[PDB]
Amino acid sequence: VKVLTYFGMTLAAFAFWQSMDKVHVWIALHQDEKQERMEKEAEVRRVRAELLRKA
Amino acid sequence: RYLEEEDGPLMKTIKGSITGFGAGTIYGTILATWKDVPRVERNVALPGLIRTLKMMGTHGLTFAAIGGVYIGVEQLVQNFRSKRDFYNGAIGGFVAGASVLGYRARSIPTAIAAGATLAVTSALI
Amino acid sequence: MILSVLSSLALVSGLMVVRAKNPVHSVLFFILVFCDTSGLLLLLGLDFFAMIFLVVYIGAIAVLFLFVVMMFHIQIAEIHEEVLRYLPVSGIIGLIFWWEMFFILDNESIPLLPTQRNTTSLRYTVYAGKVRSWTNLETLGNLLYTYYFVWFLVSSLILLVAMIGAIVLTMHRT
Amino acid sequence: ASGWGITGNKGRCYDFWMDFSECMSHCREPKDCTLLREDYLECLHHSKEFQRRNRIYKEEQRKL
Amino acid sequence: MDLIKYFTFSMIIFILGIWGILLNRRNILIMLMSIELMLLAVNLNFLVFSVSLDDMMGQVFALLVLTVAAAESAIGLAIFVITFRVRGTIAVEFINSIQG
Amino acid sequence: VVDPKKYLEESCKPKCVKPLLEYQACVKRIQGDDSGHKHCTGQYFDYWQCIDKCVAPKLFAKLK
């Protein structure tokens, strides 16, 4: 490829990596919601088992 | 052992069709990638991509048809009769296989064989 | 930011390795990926490994590839193929691998978000381990030849197999 | 877990690993060693420390 | 966020190796080179993980893997050379006789 | 003897565990009066709509 094509590709990849950084920050920001959802679903399963174990 | 769902026969049919379309797209992609290109399409890129996208569309349509008619007829048989067994879904698999695969294969014995195979695979479920 | 720059250079160079029409060019772009990797290793503080990637991967392995691929004189017709038809399958496989595999550490290694506060004063410094510092070279050499010497010798056996195979497969004595 | 540090001293998480290993060496139920195991993994990945600090950051951002 | 970025660097190298396998049906030399890219990505993971965990076992394996990579490249290029010599070409249509 | 409806409603609870927990969650959050304004009609309706759907196809088999 031409030198300028290579450099334009490198600039595109730099933009892609900065977007990846934004994605990682977003995923980090939603840890608490995910743990809360996990806890609620675990409680659902445990209540269902304890009610089914009763019979 | 099954008590995790919200159901909905119309939603069941819609989601089954969507899942079938996705599976057909992926399967058509794999089929297109596996085959070679004809000799008069090796120095040209566009026709190969067009053929791949056509294969994806065709197989997605066919698999969506299977996944929709199967679930729809299964529910319509279990609703109008109001009994839950593997007998319902066996008829749905039979009709889905027969209808769609005989439309595509253009044959009555192929439709019957597809229906029988689908009914067996649903009876084992 | 520097990691972003090196990541972009490695991404483009690797794309060039797998997509160059001329294999010789593919080998030369592979050397650029190895130089970039060496820079990353220098950022990690592992200077011995950064230099050894230059000595071995570029100085020996890539030279082997270049010597062989140059004397082949490969004509483009024997290896050419239009790759537009592989966009969908590569898209699917790459997207699946990307989502499952670029975020495999996120749940186990949750990143520390950079706050608008100087958290660099909370750096505790222990002078006991700084009295006599070991280089990465000495730390590796403390272990290779005594506590894990069997693996060292097995690697030697691997190299001996390489030599014997190279001779038995290619030698035509004059 | 090996104890060889990358700077020629004892590894950062080696003591946690050992305590986990001594615990498991005589506890017939692995659930008896849960706390030490999660201590060793926390030393490895700092997951809970970083999560709590991210909570602090989130609250600061919300109240700004 | 350091560790995740190092890991995604290794990740893109591994993914590029997979893609080089996928995209080079007619170019088996680049298939070999893609495999070498995958091996470099794994070697980097061991080094990055060794730094991250403060443990030297990652580095020992990194050196031994470099030895394996060298030997495997040597023998692979030997097999390439003999295949080329027998056929006079590297085209994949001449290495497909065994089938079924 | 014992009403088949009441028994079947009790045995259908493991199929409606998710709405029951949500209704219980609403009860705790409204235990403060707030001028007699808050209620849990929606969570109550969702829970019983699930139970009623579970009981209906099995009630009439026990009746003559």
Swiss-Prot record, chain B:
Phenotype caused by lack of the gene: Lethal when homozygous.
Subcellular locations according to the entry: Plastid, Chloroplast outer membrane; Mitochondrion outer membrane; Mitochondrion inner membrane
Record carries keyword Transmembrane: yes
Protein keywords: Acetylation, Chloroplast, Ion transport, Membrane, Mitochondrion, Mitochondrion inner membrane, Mitochondrion outer membrane, Plastid, Plastid outer membrane, Porin, Transmembrane, Transmembrane beta strand, Transmembrane helix, Transport
Annotated GO CC locations: chloroplast; chloroplast outer membrane; cytosol; mitochondrial outer membrane; mitochondrion; plastid outer membrane; pore complex; TIM22 mitochondrial import inner membrane insertion complex
Transmembrane stretches, start-end: 18-34, 56-73, 86-103
GO molecular function per UniProt: porin activity; protein homodimerization activity
GO biological process, one term: monoatomic ion transport
Top-level taxon of origin: Eukaryota
Membrane topology summary: Multi-pass membrane protein
Region of interest (Contains beta strands), residue spans: 1-59
Similarity field: Belongs to the Tim17/Tim22/Tim23 family. Plastid outer envelope porin OEP16 (TC 1.B.30) subfamily.
Assembly, per entry: Homodimer and oligomers in membrane. Part of both the NADH-ubiquinone oxidoreductase complex I and of the TIM17:23 complex. Interacts with TIM23-2.
Summary of the function given for this chain in its UniProt record: Voltage-dependent high-conductance channel with a slight cation-selectivity; selective for amino acids but excludes triosephosphates or uncharged sugars. Non-essential amino acid-selective channel protein and translocation pore for NADPH:protochlorophyllide oxidoreductase A (PORA) and possibly PORB.
Curated annotation (Swiss-Prot), chain C:
GO cellular component, one term: mitochondrial membrane
Catalyses which reaction(s): a ubiquinone + NADH + 5 H(+)(in) = a ubiquinol + NAD(+) + 4 H(+)(out)
Name under which the protein is recorded: NADH-ubiquinone oxidoreductase chain 6
Membrane spanning residue stretches: 48-68, 86-106, 150-170
Family as reported in the entry's similarity comment: Belongs to the complex I subunit 6 family.
Oligomer and partners: Complex I is composed of at least 49 different subunits.
Assigned keywords, A-Z: Electron transport, Membrane, Mitochondrion, NAD, Respiratory chain, Translocase, Transmembrane, Transmembrane helix, Transport, Ubiquinone
EC number: 7.1.1.2
Record-annotated disulphide pairs: none
Taxonomic classification: Eukaryota, Viridiplantae, Streptophyta, Embryophyta, Tracheophyta
Main location: mitochondrion
Molecular function terms from GO: NADH dehydrogenase (ubiquinone) activity
Function text: Core subunit of the mitochondrial membrane respiratory chain NADH dehydrogenase (Complex I) that is believed to belong to the minimal assembly required for catalysis. Complex I functions in the transfer of electrons from NADH to the respiratory chain. The immediate electron acceptor for the enzyme is believed to be ubiquinone.
Membrane disposition: Multi-pass membrane protein
Shown residues within the full chain: 1 to 174 of 205
Species in which this protein is naturally found: Arabidopsis thaliana (Mouse-ear cress)
Intracellular or extracellular location(s): Mitochondrion membrane
Curated annotation (Swiss-Prot), chain E:
Enzyme class, spelled out: translocase
Family to which this protein belongs: Belongs to the complex I subunit 4L family.
Function comment: Core subunit of the mitochondrial membrane respiratory chain NADH dehydrogenase (Complex I) that is believed to belong to the minimal assembly required for catalysis. Complex I functions in the transfer of electrons from NADH to the respiratory chain. The immediate electron acceptor for the enzyme is believed to be ubiquinone.
Subunit note: Complex I is composed of at least 49 different subunits.
Its EC number(s): 7.1.1.2
Localisation per UniProt entry: Mitochondrion membrane
MF term (GO), any: NADH dehydrogenase (ubiquinone) activity
Transmembrane stretches, start-end: 3-23, 28-48, 62-82
Keywords, sorted A to Z: Electron transport, Membrane, Mitochondrion, NAD, Respiratory chain, Translocase, Transmembrane, Transmembrane helix, Transport, Ubiquinone
Topology of this chain in the membrane: Multi-pass membrane protein
GO cellular component: mitochondrial membrane; NADH dehydrogenase complex
NAD found in the keyword field: yes
One biological process term in Gene Ontology: ATP synthesis coupled electron transport
A Pfam family hit: Oxidored_q2
Main location: mitochondrion
Catalysis: reaction(s): a ubiquinone + NADH + 5 H(+)(in) = a ubiquinol + NAD(+) + 4 H(+)(out)
This protein's name: NADH-ubiquinone oxidoreductase chain 4L
Organism of this sequence: Arabidopsis thaliana (Mouse-ear cress)
From Swiss-Prot, chain F:
Native source organism of the sequence: Arabidopsis thaliana (Mouse-ear cress)
Disulfide topology: C12-C54, C26-C40
Keywords: Disulfide bond, Electron transport, Membrane, Mitochondrion, Mitochondrion inner membrane, Respiratory chain, Transport
GO cellular component: mitochondrial inner membrane
GO biological processes: mitochondrial electron transport, ubiquinol to cytochrome c
Keyword Protein biosynthesis assigned: no
Record note on quaternary structure: Component of the ubiquinol-cytochrome c oxidoreductase (cytochrome b-c1 complex, complex III, CIII), a multisubunit enzyme composed of 10 subunits. The complex is composed of 3 respiratory subunits cytochrome b (MT-CYB), cytochrome c1 (CYC1-1 or CYC1-2) and Rieske protein (UCR1-1 or UCR1-2), 2 core protein subunits MPPalpha1 (or MPPalpha2) and MPPB, and 5 low-molecular weight protein subunits QCR7-1 (or QCR7-2), UCRQ-1 (or UCRQ-2), QCR9, UCRY and probably QCR6-1 (or QCR6-2).
Job description of the protein: Component of the ubiquinol-cytochrome c oxidoreductase, a multisubunit transmembrane complex that is part of the mitochondrial electron transport chain which drives oxidative phosphorylation.
Pfam families: UCR_hinge
Lineage of the species this protein comes from: Eukaryota, Viridiplantae, Streptophyta, Embryophyta, Tracheophyta
Similarity remark: Belongs to the UQCRH/QCR6 family.
Subcellular location(s) per record: Mitochondrion inner membrane
Protein name: Cytochrome b-c1 complex subunit 6-1, mitochondrial
Topology within the bilayer: Peripheral membrane protein
Presence of keyword Mitochondrion: yes
Matches recorded under InterPro entries: Cyt_b-c1_6, Ubol_cytC_Rdtase_hinge_dom, Ubol_cytC_Rdtase_hinge_dom_sf
